[PDB]
Scaffold this motif. Structure first.
Motif, PDB file in Angstrom:
ATOM      1  N   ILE A 136      41.110  39.697 -32.662  1.00 16.89           N
ATOM      2  CA  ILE A 136      40.714  40.895 -33.400  1.00 16.89           C
ATOM      3  C   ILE A 136      41.754  41.471 -34.291  1.00 16.89           C
ATOM      4  N   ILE A 137      41.902  41.625 -35.506  1.00 12.97           N
ATOM      5  CA  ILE A 137      43.156  42.451 -36.107  1.00 12.97           C
ATOM      6  C   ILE A 137      42.692  43.798 -36.008  1.00 12.97           C
ATOM      7  N   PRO A 138      43.226  44.874 -35.206  1.00 13.24           N
ATOM      8  CA  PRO A 138      42.783  45.929 -35.284  1.00 13.24           C
ATOM      9  C   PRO A 138      42.842  47.093 -36.587  1.00 13.24           C
ATOM     10  N   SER A 139      43.823  46.546 -37.324  1.00 11.32           N
ATOM     11  CA  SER A 139      44.041  47.427 -38.730  1.00 11.32           C
ATOM     12  C   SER A 139      43.042  46.986 -39.729  1.00 11.32           C
ATOM     13  N   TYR A 140      42.147  45.836 -39.501  1.00 14.08           N
ATOM     14  CA  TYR A 140      40.955  45.711 -40.505  1.00 14.08           C
ATOM     15  C   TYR A 140      39.776  45.559 -39.598  1.00 14.08           C
ATOM     16  N   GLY A 141      39.860  45.281 -38.243  1.00 15.07           N
ATOM     17  CA  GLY A 141      38.433  45.278 -37.523  1.00 15.07           C
ATOM     18  C   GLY A 141      37.887  44.054 -37.651  1.00 15.07           C
ATOM     19  N   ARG A 142      38.311  43.098 -38.209  1.00 15.66           N
ATOM     20  CA  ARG A 142      37.746  41.610 -37.936  1.00 15.66           C
ATOM     21  C   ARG A 142      38.186  41.039 -36.791  1.00 15.66           C
ATOM     22  N   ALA A 143      36.985  40.354 -36.087  1.00 15.34           N
ATOM     23  CA  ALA A 143      37.088  39.419 -34.930  1.00 15.34           C
ATOM     24  C   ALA A 143      36.849  38.136 -35.178  1.00 15.34           C
ATOM     25  N   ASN A 144      37.451  37.056 -34.381  1.00 19.17           N
ATOM     26  CA  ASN A 144      37.068  35.582 -34.528  1.00 19.17           C
ATOM     27  C   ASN A 144      36.639  35.239 -33.049  1.00 19.17           C
ATOM     28  N   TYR A 145      35.901  34.443 -32.988  1.00 21.24           N
ATOM     29  CA  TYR A 145      35.570  34.147 -31.568  1.00 21.24           C
ATOM     30  C   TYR A 145      35.538  32.287 -31.182  1.00 21.24           C
ATOM     31  N   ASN A 146      36.061  32.132 -30.034  1.00 24.81           N
ATOM     32  CA  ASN A 146      35.959  30.568 -29.436  1.00 24.81           C
ATOM     33  C   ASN A 146      34.311  29.948 -29.894  1.00 24.81           C
ATOM     34  N   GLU A 147      34.388  28.923 -30.845  1.00 26.89           N
ATOM     35  CA  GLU A 147      32.991  28.536 -31.079  1.00 26.89           C
ATOM     36  C   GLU A 147      32.472  27.494 -30.011  1.00 26.89           C
ATOM     37  N   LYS A 148      33.450  27.078 -29.195  1.00 29.29           N
ATOM     38  CA  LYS A 148      33.212  25.943 -28.163  1.00 29.29           C
ATOM     39  C   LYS A 148      32.619  26.478 -26.786  1.00 29.29           C
ATOM     40  N   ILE A 149      32.547  27.912 -26.641  1.00 27.95           N
ATOM     41  CA  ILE A 149      31.860  28.445 -25.612  1.00 27.95           C
ATOM     42  C   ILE A 149      30.840  29.378 -25.906  1.00 27.95           C
ATOM     43  N   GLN A 150      29.901  29.563 -25.122  1.00 29.01           N
ATOM     44  CA  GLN A 150      28.719  30.440 -25.059  1.00 29.01           C
ATOM     45  C   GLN A 150      29.407  31.963 -25.261  1.00 29.01           C
ATOM     46  N   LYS A 151      28.940  32.318 -26.595  1.00 24.16           N
ATOM     47  CA  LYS A 151      29.448  33.891 -26.964  1.00 24.16           C
ATOM     48  C   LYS A 151      28.958  34.903 -26.058  1.00 24.16           C
ATOM     49  N   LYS A 152      29.810  35.457 -25.134  1.00 23.12           N
ATOM     50  CA  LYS A 152      29.449  36.765 -24.462  1.00 23.12           C
ATOM     51  C   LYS A 152      30.347  37.834 -24.569  1.00 23.12           C
ATOM     52  N   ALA A 153      31.251  37.675 -25.635  1.00 20.79           N
ATOM     53  CA  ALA A 153      32.201  38.861 -25.893  1.00 20.79           C
ATOM     54  C   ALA A 153      31.923  39.545 -27.356  1.00 20.79           C
ATOM     55  N   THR A 154      32.206  40.603 -27.478  1.00 22.88           N
ATOM     56  CA  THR A 154      32.245  41.454 -28.719  1.00 22.88           C
ATOM     57  C   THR A 154      33.412  42.299 -28.706  1.00 22.88           C
TER      58      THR A 154
END
Ligand SMILES: CCCCCCCCCCCCCCCCCC(=O)OC[C@H](CO)OC(=O)CCCCCCCCCCCCCCCCC
Ligand SMILES: CCCCCCCCCCCCCCCCCC(=O)OC[C@H](CO)OC(=O)CCCCCCCCCCCCCCCCC
Ligand SMILES: CCCCCCCCCO
Ligand SMILES: CCCCCCCCCO
Ligand code: NA
Lengths: 106, 103, 219, 103, 106
Positions: free
Chosen positions: C51-69
């Protein structure tokens, strides 16, 4: 012409497990891979476009990942309705080509 | 509404039209050529912008005769449009400097 | 000062969710990215997302089941990772790391041990380990403390509030009947004990407890 | 402090600002796109300079829609800034030649 | 997605010897590789950035080399404190990926 290798040709999994189909391109093709499901006597149905982009109406258990030459279609928690042949297809270079398909068995 | 500003506006409009037509026509020329990558419209539009600005990163380019002819039209349209904008700026600066000198 | 501060542990019931935190200090830049990395016991490092805190955008590992936010609070320089509907496959140490937008993880937090289980939090009992009256000694004497019946992992064992570090081993815990047990061993010059005191400090973060035990001879 | 020199100075300042913002925003647009290389700020700044000058070596380029939109802003800012410098030079040469002819 | 292969998974060396960990990338990635040390129950610690650049506070026995697909972390004169798992990590393409780690044994 781009060869798409899908191996293994058959995947057997127990109900509720996560399953991953492999698609390997003979050359680097960015994320220009799309995934289709074909059930017995059915038409193919687009599941995932551009390697990871969701399609409206497709269950959220389906996801995709990868880029370059290696791509993966994944199902979280397989259920019976997922029994089908799964095909990848590239649109990076002419002509469009298809992989040879992977059958899901439960 | 002086002439150079009008021609700049016209040039911008025509250039946008050339980008759109060039995109569509490059896809039409390149499909059917094995190995061609300039074969879907969104990235063809990106390629047309690359070509018109001359900022040609090399991620996409035509391999056929008619795709390259299309490319040449896009190149010339972009280069001359930007030259025309420069010429309009020169005219504006020249007029303003003539007034500033009181000629 | 410690650049990234994470809680030591979180116990989560199967199906429940938990919000991990990572409070940052030191230099703060608009180009800063906060990353999260999962490490299962005895396994490698797995990138979860950024996550880039100054903008709030987050990106996630696509290879694993998304369990995080991933979220971030710029007012308290704290990044959060909400892990949702966990199974035992989600039990792991979760690290946060700061990247200055130039690709490498310059600094890492200490990691939050997340245990997914229905069992109950239990603080440890800490017992001394001093030699019996017939043991003989050489230039050194070995002492210990027995940390028994706790859940979940981890415990942190120090000797004399951290000042005694040479000569310390702490053994991996063993799990039995939903309770962990380990011991820690410390070796000092035999001439120096008991004249110079020796105390073990046992922190159990999941219980928010920290207990001391002085090792005195059986006299 | 004639107009064309002022506009050249303003253009240079704005172009520097565009390079910095373009760098930051390209990294923001490109992270999350598998395979993207325009994802750390130092080389993103190098890429923005490449893009603004049109000297596009092809070592780096955006693959996403918003990264390409950012790229287009950088391209147009660079090309027009350099055209404006050319126009200012033309105005200066024209004025000096008018004086040299005693007009 | 870039695969980083670290093999062998375990390296055994005698005290005072030079040791070299291998990291191989599935595609060419310039010098965008970074190396971390993780001791038992510890956090990872950056050792080397951009394949060969020193980090302040890291002993000068640690160095790195290589570029393209092949990279090496080296320790001149291993000592006991170097016992740890060693991980490489690439930042050339999204997403960042890690190698599977090599354990140093003395
Ligand atoms: C103004 C020039 C327009 C540039 C288009 C050239 C593309 C030729 C090509 O990319 O062609 C690609 C095309 C494949 O579709 O091949 C072909 O059929 C090309 C055959 C006809 C093209 C003209 C051939 C002339 C070269 C002789 C000049 C040197 C003197 C000797
Ligand atoms: C002024 C033009 C700005 C150039 C940006 C084009 C980038 C499209 C892209 O790189 O897109 C990349 C993007 C992936 O993120 O894909 C996408 O969603 C793109 C979908 C929307 C983009 C417009 C599509 C129009 C093409 C039709 C013109 C030919 C007439 C037929
Ligand atoms: C200059 C515009 C030419 C249009 C190209 C049409 C493609 C013909 C393919 O045979
Ligand atoms: C023209 C500037 C656009 C800024 C790009 C922001 C990135 C949004 C990513 O979803
Ligand atoms: Na150029």
């Amino acid at each position: 012409d781009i060869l798409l290798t899908q191996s293994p040709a058959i995947l057997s999994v127990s109900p509720g497990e996560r399953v991953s189909f492999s698609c390997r391109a003979s050359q680097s093709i960015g994320t220009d891979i799309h995934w289709y499901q074909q059930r017995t006597n059915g038409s193919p149905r687009l599941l995932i476009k551009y390697a990871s982009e969701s399609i409206s109406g497709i269950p959220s258990r389906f996801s995709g990942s990868g880029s370059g030459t290696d791509f993966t279609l994944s199902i979280n928690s397989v259920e019976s309705e997922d029994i089908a042949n799964y095909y990848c297809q590239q649109s990076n270079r002419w002509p469009f080509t298809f992989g040879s398909g992977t059958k899901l068995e439960i | 509404s002086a002439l150079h500003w009008r021609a700049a506006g016209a040039a911008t409009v025509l250039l946008v039209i050339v980008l759109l037509a060039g995109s569509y026509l490059a896809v039409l020329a390149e499909r059917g050529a094995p190995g061609a990558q300039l074969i879907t419209y969104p990235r063809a539009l990106w390629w047309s912008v690359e070509t018109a600005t001359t900022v040609a990163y090399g991620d996409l380019y035509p391999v056929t005769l008619w795709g390259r002819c299309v490319a040449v039209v896009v190149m010339v349209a972009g280069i001359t449009s930007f030259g025309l904008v420069t010429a309009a700026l020169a005219t504006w600066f020249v007029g303003r400097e003539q007034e500033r000198r009181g000629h | 000062q410690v650049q990234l501060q994470q809680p030591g542990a979180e116990l989560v019931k199967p199906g429940a969710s938990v919000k991990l935190s990572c409070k940052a200090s030191g230099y703060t830049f608009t180009s800063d990215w906060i990353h999260w990395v999962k490490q299962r016991p005895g396994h490698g490092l797995e990138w979860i997302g950024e996550i880039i805190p100054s903008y709030g955008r987050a990106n996630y590992n696509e290879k694993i089941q998304k369990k995080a936010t991933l979220t971030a609070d710029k007012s308290s320089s704290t990044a959060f990772m909400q892990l949702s509907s966990l199974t035992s496959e989600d039990s792991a140490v979760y690290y946060c790391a700061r990247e200055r937008g130039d690709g490498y993880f310059a600094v890492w937090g200490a990691g939050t041990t997340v245990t997914v289980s229905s069992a109950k939090t239990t603080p440890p009992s800490v017992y001394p380990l001093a030699p019996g009256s017939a043991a003989q000694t050489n230039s050194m004497v070995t002492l210990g403390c027995l940390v028994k019946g706790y859940f979940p992992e981890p415990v942190t064992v120090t000797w004399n509030s951290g000042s005694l570090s040479s000569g310390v081993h702490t053994f991996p815990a063993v799990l039995q009947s939903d309770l962990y047990t380990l011991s820690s061993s410390v070796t000092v010059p035999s001439s120096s004990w008991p004249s110079e005191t020796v105390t073990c400090n046992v922190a159990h973060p999941a219980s928010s407890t920290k207990v001391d035990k002085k090792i005195v001879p059986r006299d």
